Amino acid sequence: AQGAQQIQLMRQQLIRQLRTGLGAEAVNKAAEIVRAHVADPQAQSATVDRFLSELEQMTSRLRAASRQSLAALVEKFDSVAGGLDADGLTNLADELASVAKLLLSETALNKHLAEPTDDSAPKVRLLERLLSDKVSATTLDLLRTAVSNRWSTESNLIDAVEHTARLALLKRAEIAGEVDEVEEQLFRFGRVLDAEPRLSALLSDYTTPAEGRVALLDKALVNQTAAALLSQTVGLLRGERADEAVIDLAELAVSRRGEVVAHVSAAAELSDAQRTRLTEVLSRIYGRPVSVQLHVDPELLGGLSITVGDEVIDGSIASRLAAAQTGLP
């Protein structure tokens, strides 16, 4: 009986490894057929159309105190901006970056100024003495609420002052009507600092004097708003990845319009006839206005892949080839 079963299992492993071999030969031939078929631009357009039609058929990073205090600070910045002007706003953003540098350097002052307290008057009086001659009154009026509120860490004050200096600078783009231009330049700088891994790692210079990175941007890298945003960000970089920081600037800039960014991957050159439908279906899916950061690449040939938030919808000849080849018996 052990011999009879040994023969049956030997036969079974022969017809099994036969099926593994026939499957491997069939998948590798089908991969050659689809890789040839994907060479026509009409075949790529048919694949993205089949995906688009299928899709047609188908502060939150901060702790509570810092979140609530940032929402209250932004609610006062809305009031400041309502009576602001571009020549005032550019000075407000530079002055708010200057105090963010001061807090980042004088870490004793920052540790005291970020002290979570309801009777916050001594902290306001410290800030009044230190700043009232150095900087304009409208920044003081905004830093009074920035200091009087409660922060979860001594970092989150600096993170709120930096974010407010970024908002004040974006507001110039929003009032002048350059918002689409500054967004396109921030995505351009975000893709280039992601494809240029030497200069962006050298721009992460928070171990070095920041003015060297400001001069590096002035030499290597335009709308003066986008240059001011990049220079403000590298000044205050505090060990974040430079490309990931610029992407987070672009995410804030689109979020000011109420929209969200879907990164998109394709064979090459997704035509505007595709882009208008793709924006419309993404908007229907996620319930928001959208913008597409087209990251075309030949390795993911055929179909369309998209990522937005944590989620993805990923239909491509490569991703479906892996799905077919892994599914062999």
């Binding site: 492993q13 069939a26 299928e54 702790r63 919808i313």
Partner: protein
């Protein structure tokens, strides 16, 4: 041959379908030593299986405010920072079914014997809760092990947990492999109530020990009904931690269907050592003996999930034989005394008995089976109904009288009876006695015919 070989792949190709539904993606932001932390995944569940890009799976054990502490269940060498991680949409689960009988599997329920793919019946979650007090039944029918020193003196019933605790090289795997082999005379009946299915969970065994156990089961025909869940010592502490739950889930599926199951865990001290490694890489504070605090709730949640079910649940059962290695033969150690308190009895295999010719080497004083004479046929309850107490009193009297110059007439009669019982309970490996031979063998001792 050729028509089925082509036809199976033609049915596969015809079934192949688009994956164009969304999924969430995280990215690994820290990885090494068999752990990874995954950024993102805003909706991942606790103990969700995660798909890493190398085919390898992990489990989300910690969920922080901005990071997920995943344990990797496989070859972590291919994991690095920045690559994408997809959620599975599945709490930690393994495939189960009748197709596992006669296979050697990873703790993910995928084969390593090198035979074909396993035609799994369903998935089962590894963390489905134990049958509550109102769902259980009194252990009342025996597992015959074929070993006189167990079946007559520390009996094992269907739904027992019997801890085969001992020192290194004392026959712990020999007792459990003999127990799994002895079930063939019941399996061949084809009657689902007599028929016992087996699972042998090898945790941290060397791969040639697992291949030795496998061929010992092939020689006796036990691979007809035994699944081996092999976490050989080569694989990462994720698999070595998980293997007992994969054995327990594969077992539970037959148990809940009304089959009888036997699980052997070889060895639970190496699962406790793997869970220590996993917890210390995740940086949880160690408790006592450097083990995690919940090292009890590792073994209780494992072992308490095997018991005999009520007739309202098909009346199936699962019987656990956990094994423990007692470092320097101390029974009074932390992990030993946890598993001794989770289980229903001990077979403490003393290495000093094993050397002095007493093999299987059961330390009759400390070893016990708390189900007792419910886990025996009536004839064994007759002939052996106090045999453990007679042999422990003999080992006490033999320790005491070892230096007396003379003895009382009854003390002499007891000390000369015990020596007949100890020689009667010796047994060579691979000689399983049928219960009908065990009851007669014990009858010679307890009625004094051997005197």
């Amino acid at each position: 041959s050729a028509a089925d070989i082509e036809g199976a792949i033609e049915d596969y190709v015809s079934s192949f379908s688009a994956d164009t539904e969304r999924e969430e993606i995280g990215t690994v932001i820290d990885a090494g030593d068999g752990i990874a932390h995954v950024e993102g995944l805003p909706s991942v569940m606790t103990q969700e299986l995660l798909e890493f890009p190398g085919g390898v799976l992990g489990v989300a054990l910690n969920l922080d405010e901005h990071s997920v502490g995943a344990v990797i269940l496989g070859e972590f060498e291919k994991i690095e920072e920045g690559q994408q991680v997809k959620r599975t949409g599945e709490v930690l689960s393994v495939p189960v079914g009748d197709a596992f009988l006669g296979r050697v599997v990873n703790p993910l329920g995928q084969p390593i014997d090198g035979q074909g793919d396993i035609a799994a019946e369903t998935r089962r979650a590894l963390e489905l809760q134990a049958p509550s007090v109102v769902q259980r039944q009194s252990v009342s029918e025996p597992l015959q092990t074929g070993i006189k020193a167990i079946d007559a003196m520390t009996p094992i019933g269907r739904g027992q947990r019997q801890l085969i605790i001992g020192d290194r090289k004392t026959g712990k795997t020999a007792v459990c492999v003999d127990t799994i082999l002895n079930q063939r005379e019941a399996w061949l009946t084809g009657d689902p109530k007599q028929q016992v299915r087996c699972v042998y969970v090898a945790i941290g065994q060397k791969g040639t020990t697992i291949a030795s156990v496998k061929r010992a089961l092939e020689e006796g025909g036990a691979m007809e009904y035994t699944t081996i869940v092999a976490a050989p010592a080569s694989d990462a502490a994720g698999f070595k931690w998980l293997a007992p739950y994969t054995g327990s889930a594969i077992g539970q599926h037959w148990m809940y269907n009304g089959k009888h199951v036997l699980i052997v865990f070889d060895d639970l001290s190496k699962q406790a050592d793997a869970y220590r490694a996993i917890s210390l890489l995740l940086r949880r504070p160690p408790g006592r003996e450097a083990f995690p605090g919940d090292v009890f709730y590792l073994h209780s949640r494992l072992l308490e999930r095997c018991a005999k079910l009520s007739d309202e649940l098909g009346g199936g059962s699962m019987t656990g034989l956990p094994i423990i290695e007692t470092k320097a033969n101390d029974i009074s150690a932390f992990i030993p005394t946890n598993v001794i308190s989770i289980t229903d009895g001990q077979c403490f295999l003393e290495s000093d008995l094993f050397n002095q010719g007493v093999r299987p080497a059961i330390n009759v004083g400390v070893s016990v089976s708390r189900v007792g004479g419910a886990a025996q046929i009536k004839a064994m309850k007759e002939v052996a109904g106090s045999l453990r107490l007679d042999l422990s009193q003999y080992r006490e009297l033999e320790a005491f009288a070892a230096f007396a110059s003379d003895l009382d007439a009854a003390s002499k009669a007891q000390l000369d009876r015990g020596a007949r019982l100890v020689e009667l309970l010796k047994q060579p490996q691979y000689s399983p006695l049928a219960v009908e031979e065990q009851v007669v063998a014990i009858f010679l001792g307890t009625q004094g015919h051997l005197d």
